[PDB]
Write an enzyme that holds these catalytic residues in place. Structure first.
Site, PDB file in Angstrom:
ATOM      1  N   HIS A 137      -2.047 -12.395  -7.230  1.00 38.73           N
ATOM      2  CA  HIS A 137      -1.925 -11.052  -7.801  1.00 38.73           C
ATOM      3  C   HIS A 137      -0.802 -11.043  -8.798  1.00 38.73           C
ATOM      4  CE1 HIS A 137      -4.643  -9.084  -4.763  1.00 38.73           C
ATOM      5  NE2 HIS A 137      -4.220 -10.083  -4.012  1.00 38.73           N
ATOM      6  N   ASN A 172      -7.319  -4.215  -1.295  1.00 43.88           N
ATOM      7  CA  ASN A 172      -8.129  -4.766  -2.439  1.00 43.88           C
ATOM      8  C   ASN A 172      -9.220  -3.793  -2.739  1.00 43.88           C
ATOM      9  OD1 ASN A 172      -6.660  -7.162  -2.740  1.00 43.88           O
ATOM     10  ND2 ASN A 172      -8.128  -8.424  -1.650  1.00 43.88           N
TER      11      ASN A 172
HETATM   12  C1  HEM Z   1      -7.132  -8.642   3.586  1.00 49.73           C
HETATM   13  C2  HEM Z   1      -6.681  -9.602   2.806  1.00 49.73           C
HETATM   14  C3  HEM Z   1      -5.555  -9.486   1.787  1.00 49.73           C
HETATM   15  C4  HEM Z   1      -5.356  -8.452   0.938  1.00 49.73           C
HETATM   16  C5  HEM Z   1      -6.143  -7.098   0.912  1.00 49.73           C
HETATM   17  C6  HEM Z   1      -4.169  -8.785   0.136  1.00 49.73           C
HETATM   18  C7  HEM Z   1      -3.677  -7.959  -0.899  1.00 49.73           C
HETATM   19  C8  HEM Z   1      -2.631  -8.334  -1.703  1.00 49.73           C
HETATM   20  C9  HEM Z   1      -2.168  -7.588  -2.848  1.00 49.73           C
HETATM   21  C10 HEM Z   1      -2.871  -6.338  -3.354  1.00 49.73           C
HETATM   22  C11 HEM Z   1      -1.094  -8.226  -3.374  1.00 49.73           C
HETATM   23  C12 HEM Z   1      -0.295  -7.811  -4.631  1.00 49.73           C
HETATM   24  C13 HEM Z   1       0.821  -6.778  -4.249  1.00 49.73           C
HETATM   25  C14 HEM Z   1       1.557  -6.409  -5.511  1.00 49.73           C
HETATM   26  O1  HEM Z   1       0.914  -5.736  -6.327  1.00 49.73           O
HETATM   27  O2  HEM Z   1       2.715  -6.913  -5.712  1.00 49.73           O
HETATM   28  C15 HEM Z   1      -0.846  -9.401  -2.531  1.00 49.73           C
HETATM   29  C16 HEM Z   1       0.197 -10.271  -2.711  1.00 49.73           C
HETATM   30  C17 HEM Z   1       0.453 -11.346  -1.897  1.00 49.73           C
HETATM   31  N1  HEM Z   1      -0.242 -11.716  -0.778  1.00 49.73           N
HETATM   32 FE1  HEM Z   1      -1.918 -10.789  -0.018  1.00 49.73          FE
HETATM   33  N2  HEM Z   1      -3.744 -10.028   0.538  1.00 49.73           N
HETATM   34  C18 HEM Z   1      -4.565 -10.517   1.549  1.00 49.73           C
HETATM   35  C19 HEM Z   1      -4.442 -11.755   2.210  1.00 49.73           C
HETATM   36  C20 HEM Z   1      -3.306 -12.512   2.118  1.00 49.73           C
HETATM   37  C21 HEM Z   1      -2.960 -13.608   3.024  1.00 49.73           C
HETATM   38  C22 HEM Z   1      -3.849 -14.119   4.260  1.00 49.73           C
HETATM   39  C23 HEM Z   1      -1.794 -14.049   2.677  1.00 49.73           C
HETATM   40  C24 HEM Z   1      -0.948 -15.189   3.248  1.00 49.73           C
HETATM   41  C25 HEM Z   1      -1.010 -15.377   4.585  1.00 49.73           C
HETATM   42  C26 HEM Z   1      -1.318 -13.298   1.492  1.00 49.73           C
HETATM   43  C27 HEM Z   1      -0.112 -13.565   0.877  1.00 49.73           C
HETATM   44  C28 HEM Z   1       0.306 -12.879  -0.257  1.00 49.73           C
HETATM   45  C29 HEM Z   1       1.435 -13.266  -1.031  1.00 49.73           C
HETATM   46  C30 HEM Z   1       2.261 -14.541  -0.952  1.00 49.73           C
HETATM   47  C31 HEM Z   1       1.537 -12.231  -2.114  1.00 49.73           C
HETATM   48  C32 HEM Z   1       2.606 -12.316  -3.207  1.00 49.73           C
HETATM   49  C33 HEM Z   1       3.386 -11.146  -2.485  1.00 49.73           C
HETATM   50  C34 HEM Z   1       4.602 -10.935  -3.331  1.00 49.73           C
HETATM   51  O3  HEM Z   1       5.058 -11.835  -4.183  1.00 49.73           O
HETATM   52  O4  HEM Z   1       5.335  -9.924  -3.295  1.00 49.73           O
HETATM   53  N3  HEM Z   1      -2.244 -12.332   1.253  1.00 49.73           N
HETATM   54  N4  HEM Z   1      -1.748  -9.448  -1.500  1.00 49.73           N
END
Ligand code: HEM
Ligand code: HEM
Ligand code: HEM
EC number: 1.11.1.6
Lengths: 726, 726, 308, 83
Positions: C101, C174
């Site tokens: 993202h 999402n």
């Molecule tokens: C239902 C499944 C998931 C959804 C709906 C989701 C949604 C999102 C969204 C919308 C963002 C961007 C947030 C922003 O705008 O800064 C994000 C960032 C991120 N997500 Fe998820 N994600 C999912 C699964 C995962 C999983 C399984 C992991 C790791 C175990 C993960 C790790 C991360 C990481 C590393 C970021 C970067 C966060 C940051 O730098 O601040 N995500 N996710």
């Protein structure tokens, strides 16, 4: 050429006693001490002799003494890329110190089992007595910074990294068999309480301040490790002369899948030995690097630190057989109840080359286990598992810290992890994910098995609700402190009282002192009363009447908890000060030095100035240091041979040397006219146990001194030291 | 076993044309292509096949599909150290991108000089035609992020890391021979103005926005490089078909101490070639990785990018002999005045193995020079010297970035610098300072000399007061823009006017458009009027009377400034789309494909679906891509063989394929009934130049098509395209 | 080097349709739009009109056009601290982008519930229809870098930070109601497979390449979210015209201790609308900032994005 | 930059000036100040060139270095006067 013509700038590459040669990087001092880990580091070791000085980009430098300027008195120019790189590297040399255990000293060595433990664990490193495992061990204090002093009163860390054929196993232990708290959620509270207080960042390397005693008085679970810290355990003589413990109950898992509960032990083959408080505190001033130096010089001398690995083994069906909980890390397993099985020996035989590269950057973590070992639900252990990888992200700069040379496994490592800051490995796999077809799914998972199998957790049954709640079985705080107290000798008990009395005197708020004395009265009345008397506190009626806690499974003491109850003294690697005069009786020196050499005890020859003196037969005697320059704090005993005693009899420094040694309960030996010094330490004409005296230094005089040294200190002298002004 | 039985998952380890086989890590694709640097990387290359999957600590993993939980539907447990490492490493994969030139594509290769240049420089890499120097070259855009598109309008970076026997030399240049600004102090202003605007972070990869042209309108020193960016130079066909320049005047220093001014050139041996604006913009959509892909696939095919290094040399006594200041980076040195002397050849012949490890972490810096080279007082160069080491401290995490494998010298490097984050080298030197006696002063400084000597700066005389002042000799802004304009062909000038017109149309504030038009009227009235007309702006009588800037040392044009005025066409490595039908004339396809192969021109067989089609004689033809899938933007020319044309005559995608290739001036050849497509592109019965047509693909058909391809595009078609709706 | 006399450099601080004025920072475009979070940021907002140009240490700069040198054609001097601070700050501008993202566009706003939800939850921000909660929302793609294009085929993130009186609640969702995989342990595998391939770092912003389809073919649990990605859900017309979902089942807990399972949804009040592929792909080239721009201009025009 | 984590160390409260500070520098790790200037470069017309340079003067003027005379060759050499 700047080196002296005679080559006396370079230490001999052979074992030499403390102070005989300048110390040196380990691969120069002992180039043929080898193990698989030390050999695998060869790819990053860098030499120097005969090479040109260059920038980091390989450019030869012509003038490493001057910046580039417009005119020789002119301004420095931005285009000096050589000065810029050199200053830029210097500007960024420091990395964050460890949050705890920042102060520590480390050496390479090896481990080998005494026999195959395959009946109880499938851990490959324990499978065969001929399997040799390289280790890197770091000893530490806990509270002070990387620049704080060694001989503080503190717990010590004892961390071993085992480079096994099936993974790195880190056994990250301390020198006492329990910890201060029960649940990892409290760690930042306890650590903030013991560390320098936040307004003014005082005091360094000391628990002797209000916030630590406030927390202890409010959290009685701490009292057991507090008892150990206030005992002479808190002030070891040397990292070679303390015990090590993993603290937590872990599991061994064998090839049949049976789990056995285990607690880990390291037994020092040089024996247990600790300083006394006045000596330890004064030594933080005279040599704050005393333990780091002692470890380094012991290894340079061939007095390798040796430890025997021990296991306390408890069958799974015995989990609830004690009156304490096996998962409670504030509880010890008395050896009288569960004996330590001796399992193998670890020898530390080579110093690092570069302290920063190898010690400061080493990263140990208790979650680093291998197949054949497993965790338990101990709530302190459980939370540790989250801390040690996370902290390495800021301390060591990112997630590739396992590629820093000292941290690298010596066994293969292959997976689909990629990138991160300072990525060294260049992956050629077409695939960075699995399942993949485009590299036929390699590297591939491996089922668990008896040897070389993948890691599978022991399938422990979990039944309960999601709760933030302490097990009621952990809610007992006084019985182990009491068991420890009753297991100490009477002089050990006096030293405990004195530790509490000294620390509590430095607590400014008197109600905290009173609340701590209340806690002591729940442990033992005699202890409580003795501390109270030193603080001008009177126990209440109620406090006098507190019922003492129960014995531990019928035990009212366990001598394995004492440093000294059971003799286990070893003099090899200890050190004797020899106080010279300007016409020493050469026959005394020959006898002394001969007898010391036979027992591997070192000597330092001291006088009132540097250079040499000449003995009665014209033997030239080099002087190692002055009386003030190498105080009795730094030695285990003092010998004054015969000769022209009037040279030294009114040296204030010589007399002081002897009074200090005497106060600190060190063996003293006086030959011939050296007995004139008996007056400075108020010794009776007919002698006193712990003072060796004769007409001359024959082999009988030396056998006596050496027998005192084996018993470490002269405890019988305690009631006498009160009177000497030192 | 997930690979297909037939081994078709794995590309052949031999040179293959674009799209024939999946692309792969360079050491797998071309394991026999070696050089000293690629061989020195072997210590950190990690394979994968036949290895067990492990943690980073070397523990084999059994189940890489599941977290550890309490029950198969229960909560994840904190003790899952395998999940924790794997997610931790993923969580920290990213590092900051470069502040500028974040988008870039790189390759390994080697350089060799044609003859020894000892008479003019003591640089070791230029001393002997038989001395081969490994290189790593990264090409880049300037403005956009690492995830931005390749075929934007922008300047391109061309950076070469020469791993020499006397140190790393980095020649960090661009694809135009001047920069936008004069003094490094303005670089953050200029870059801020071109990068995305700070409130909303728009637009990416584009100078077409208010703040860029606001800055240009207020800083006329920019106009020269703005002319180059608005020309087709701003949209190269490929990094293989653009020129490179070091921009600044540097110095060469020979063994006798003589300094010669030098400007560095790279000449593309594949020739100069650019896209046209509509095609480049549309290609940023259909394939934003087009240049990265093209470079990698040329190398996999054996169409190695080759470049000739050239020097413009100016004697010290001629410093003041031109109308412009040699130290002003906004001024070029016309090749009519000072020819480029051919120096040696660079061949790029192997892709990296891992883009992040080798490309993303590469660090180039123009201060990395070697003895035999030196700086001048160019005030833009002087400031660069402070930036490129400093930025690497955050980008690459600290001062040991030279230990990241791709950055390492292949020559010796030894010095007294120690520690810093991520320290890999374990120094054994007893000394970390000089002068020292304890290591006999090693590593030692080395005097300068003719070969293998230490670096000493040329002793240039400096005389003046400490001032923040631009030299009056730098205050001329329009003559070099005008020389560039006058040197372009009429079609190049049209493309320049259209570049300015398109960009200024995206400037929301109209007064900025007007101000830019006023600057253009200081350069050339024809150019200004033609841009004004496109913007609906009328020049004032004062603007119409501005007198033109003077010629540059008597020159009113220099054809070396044009991409196209002097033919340098090379068809090898170009690609042709072949639009198939379901019954192709197999004889046409035989003649087409073999003629292309003989000249090293690649082909892509396109159809309305994937799979296969069968030719008239039963030959089975595999389809590379659909007409929409591999649009005409991605090829250099289009051939339509004879066959069943009614198959594709009503396919809008097929017809549009030709209209797009036609609009973008690409050669088109139509065999037999394929000439029915003439009406789609409105070709007269009697034909037109730039359209090849015949009854079959035999005889001179392919030669005529290849002749058009040598000339790159059909410029005479420009008037006819205005009308076509494509 | 100044403003035009007519004041045309400066956008009107009133709602205006897209293209009518240059866009501008929110506080200058709409100074009277406030909420508790926007106001609380006033301690760190920094203006600029009428203020002198300084170093970060507050020293006024006289000449921001030139380095200090020994003579006007001479070498730059190390003592030029004003050049040094300026170039140092520049040299350290970038921070790592988000692992996923990384490409995203954000705005401030506010939320309020239609009625109290106290019978099913004790969450304070849902307790009172007249208690407003400021929000900050970031919409994103998944695969591409922060400089990648908006109208790619990809899943979109829809992350809302609610600044409640009882703490920050982030609803990190999402634009499809499922994810591709079942267990977090596989996330780095899945993400590695969809991201640019590791030898050459191609393709940006596209699942259209061998590794992604390899993983999908070998992990049929991905097929559901893959169907969504391949439909026109993969290419929304605007962040205003897509749905949001928290995907996971969470719980609501009321004051009595009762747990209710809940899945979260955002309904776009501007309706559901998507591009078509050829248009979406070409628009990545003609305007790779299309959705960023469209969101920003809708807010400047008063077409505020609304979601239920 | 490594000790305090980036180029915004002047925004750490103890290091902050008490007098005004305004310039065109942006971003960097841990950026606190939220700039509203339409322009992050100068010269600019879109914010009438603010914040603006200030000539040197007796008070409240911009910094100008003393125009010390520099004369010599580019050398790495200690002045004999220091020996
Ligand atoms: C239902 C499944 C998931 C959804 C709906 C989701 C949604 C999102 C969204 C919308 C963002 C961007 C947030 C922003 O705008 O800064 C994000 C960032 C991120 N997500 Fe998820 N994600 C999912 C699964 C995962 C999983 C399984 C992991 C790791 C175990 C993960 C790790 C991360 C990481 C590393 C970021 C970067 C966060 C940051 O730098 O601040 N995500 N996710
Ligand atoms: C029985 C209880 C514990 C023992 C025996 C123990 C032992 C140690 C030792 C010996 C070290 C130093 C390793 C080295 O030399 O580099 C250390 C470091 C550390 N410990 Fe513990 N520890 C305990 C409890 C905890 C807890 C509960 C936490 C957090 C929840 C914690 C977090 C850390 C951290 C952050 C470091 C610095 C680690 C590093 O920077 O690499 N410890 N511990
Ligand atoms: C003649 C004018 C210049 C040319 C030809 C030039 C060329 C380049 C190139 C080709 C790169 C990319 C190297 C790579 O592929 O990693 C780059 C990076 C860079 N340049 Fe320059 N540049 C110019 C002016 C400047 C100036 C005046 C400054 C600042 C004082 C500057 C600072 C930077 C920085 C910060 C980077 C990122 C370097 C890194 O992260 O490794 N450049 N430049």
């Amino acid at each position: 050429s700047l080196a002296p013509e005679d080559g006396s700038h370079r230490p001999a590459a052979e074992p030499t006693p403390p102070g005989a040669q300048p110390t040196a990087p380990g691969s120069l001092k002992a180039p043929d001490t080898r193990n698989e880990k030390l050999n695998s580091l060869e790819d990053v070791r860098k030499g120097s002799e005969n090479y040109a000085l260059t920038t980091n980009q390989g450019v030869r430098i012509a003038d490493d003494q001057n910046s580039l300027r417009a005119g020789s008195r002119g301004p420095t120019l931005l285009e000096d890329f050589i000065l810029r790189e050199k200053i830029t590297h210097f500007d960024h040399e420091r990395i964050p110190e460890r949050i705890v255990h920042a102060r520590g000293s480390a050496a390479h060595g090896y481990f080998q089992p005494y026999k195959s433990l395959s009946d109880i664990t499938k851990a490959d490193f324990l499978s065969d007595p001929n399997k040799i495992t390289p280790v890197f061990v770091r000893f530490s204090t806990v509270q002070g910074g990387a620049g704080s002093a060694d001989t503080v009163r503190d717990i010590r860390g004892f961390a071993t990294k085992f480079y096994t054929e099936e993974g790195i196993f880190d056994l990250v232990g301390n020198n006492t068999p329990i910890f201060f708290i029960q649940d990892a959620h409290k760690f930042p509270d306890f650590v903030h309480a013991v560390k320098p207080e936040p307004h003014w960042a005082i005091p360094q390397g000391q628990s002797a301040h209000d916030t630590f005693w406030d927390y202890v008085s409010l959290q009685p679970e701490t009292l057991h490790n507090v008892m150990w810290a206030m005992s002479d355990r808190g002030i070891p003589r040397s990292y070679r002369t303390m015990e090590g413990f993993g603290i937590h109950t872990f599991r061994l898992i064998n090839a049949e899948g049976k789990a056995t509960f285990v607690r880990f032990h390291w037994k020092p083959l040089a024996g247990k030995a600790s300083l006394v408080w006045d000596e330890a505190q004064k030594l933080t001033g005279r040599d704050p690097d005393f333990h780091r130096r002692e470890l380094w010089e012991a290894i340079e001398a061939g007095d390798f630190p040796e430890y025997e690995l021990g296991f306390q083994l408890i069958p799974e069906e015995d989990e609830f057989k004690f009156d304490f909980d096996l998962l409670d890390p504030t509880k010890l397993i008395p050896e009288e109840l569960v004996p330590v099985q001796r399992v193998g020996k670890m020898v530390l035989n080579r110093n690092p080359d570069n302290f920063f590269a190898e010690n400061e950057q080493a990263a140990f973590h208790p979650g680093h286990i291998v197949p054949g070992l497993d965790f338990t639900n101990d709530p302190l252990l459980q939370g540790r598992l989250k801390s040690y990888t996370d902290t390495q992200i800021s301390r060591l700069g990112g997630p590739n810290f396992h590629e820093i040379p000292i941290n690298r496994p010596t066994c293969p490592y292959h997976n689909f992890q990629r990138d991160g800051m300072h990525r060294m490995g260049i992956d050629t796999n077409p695939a960075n994910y699995e399942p993949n077809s485009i590299n036929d799914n390699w590297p591939r998972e491996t089922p668990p098995g008896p040897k070389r199998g993948g890691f599978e957790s022991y399938q422990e049954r979990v039944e309960g609700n999601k709760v933030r709640e302490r097990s009621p079985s952990f809610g007992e705080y006084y019985s182990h402190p009491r068991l420890f107290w009753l297991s100490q000798t009477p002089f050990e008990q006096r030293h405990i009282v004195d530790g509490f009395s000294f620390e509590l005197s430095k607590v400014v708020r008197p109600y905290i002192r009173e609340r701590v004395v209340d806690q002591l009265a729940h442990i033992d009345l005699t202890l409580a009363q003795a501390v109270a008397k030193n603080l001008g506190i009177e126990l209440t009626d109620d406090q006098l009447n507190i019922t003492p806690p129960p014995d531990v499974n019928g035990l009212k003491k366990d001598p394995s908890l004492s440093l000294y109850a059971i003799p286990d003294g070893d003099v090899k690697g200890r050190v004797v000060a020899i106080l010279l005069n300007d016409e020493v009786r050469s026959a005394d020196l020959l006898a002394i030095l001969k007898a010391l050499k036979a027992k591997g005890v070192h000597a330092k020859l001291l006088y009132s100035r540097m250079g040499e003196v000449t003995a009665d037969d014209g033997t030239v005697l080099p002087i190692a240091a002055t009386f003030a320059g190498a105080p009795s704090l730094t030695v285990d005993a003092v010998i004054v041979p015969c000769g022209n005693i009037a040279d030294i009899a009114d040296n204030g420094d010589a007399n002081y040397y002897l009074m200090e040694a005497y106060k600190h309960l060190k063996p003293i030996a006086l030959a011939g006219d050296a007995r004139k010094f008996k007056a400075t330490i108020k010794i009776a004409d007919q002698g006193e146990e712990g003072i060796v005296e004769a007409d001359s230094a024959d082999g009988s005089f030396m056998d006596e001194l050496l027998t005192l040294m084996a018993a470490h200190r002269v405890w019988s002298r305690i009631p006498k030291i009160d009177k000497i002004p030192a």
